[PDB]
Amino acid sequence: TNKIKAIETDIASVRQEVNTAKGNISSLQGDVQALQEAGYIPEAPRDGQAYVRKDGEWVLLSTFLSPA
Amino acid sequence: TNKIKAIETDIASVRQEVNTAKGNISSLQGDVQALQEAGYIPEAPRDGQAYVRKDGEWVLLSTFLSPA
Amino acid sequence: TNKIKAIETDIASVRQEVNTAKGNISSLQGDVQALQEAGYIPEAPRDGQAYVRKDGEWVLLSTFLSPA
């Protein structure tokens, strides 16, 4: 009985795949982190009004096409 | 022959790493889900025109700097 | 001693989990790729000014509420 050699290569095989996965997992984390740090902006309200961007918020455009 | 004890701790080791990976995988999924639900907006056309945001779309600013 | 059968099912078990993980990892990659390709836009400056979008950049709205 040497089924200990087949079991060994089988564990070695799984271990390699786990190493590859740990790598893709690390890559994924760095990509998600960058996406999170990009500071993207959410959608403007969907209320039939036009919006412009100011101080991290959507402000009504008509607000500036009037004095006040 | 006790190489069954070394094989056991080796499987235990891989299993722990797989547990850690399952965790980072779950964390990644929750982060990607939130990024997907944030409702970010795509780029405006790159055609030399100015755009404002309205009803989930980029509309030409000049459209409002005119009556119609 | 058949602890070789228990070790076998244990490796089989870990291998299945590793297969599931490889799948969730692949799914995550396709989702992150799409998020990266969506071409979202970063925040406008936070300087108290109103901005509109033009040619892949935030341009001051007042720039168009004046001839030049």
UniProtKB/Swiss-Prot annotation, chains A, B, C:
It comes from the Viruses. It is found in: Virion. Cross-linked via an isopeptide bond to E.coli host protein DncV during infection. Residues 1-35 form a coiled coil. Chaperone involved in tail fiber assembly and retraction. Acts as a chaperone helping to attach the long tail fibers to the virus during the assembly process. During phage assembly, twelve fibritin molecules attach to the phage neck via gp13: six molecules forming the collar and six molecules forming the whiskers. Homotrimer. Interacts (via N-terminal domain) with neck protein gp13; this interaction allows attachment of the fibrous collar and wiskers. The central domain consists of 12 alpha-helical domains (19-40 residues long) with coiled-coil structural patterns. This is Fibritin. The lineage of its organism: Viruses, Duplodnaviria, Heunggongvirae, Uroviricota, Caudoviricetes. The chain holds residues 420 to 487 of 487 of the full protein.
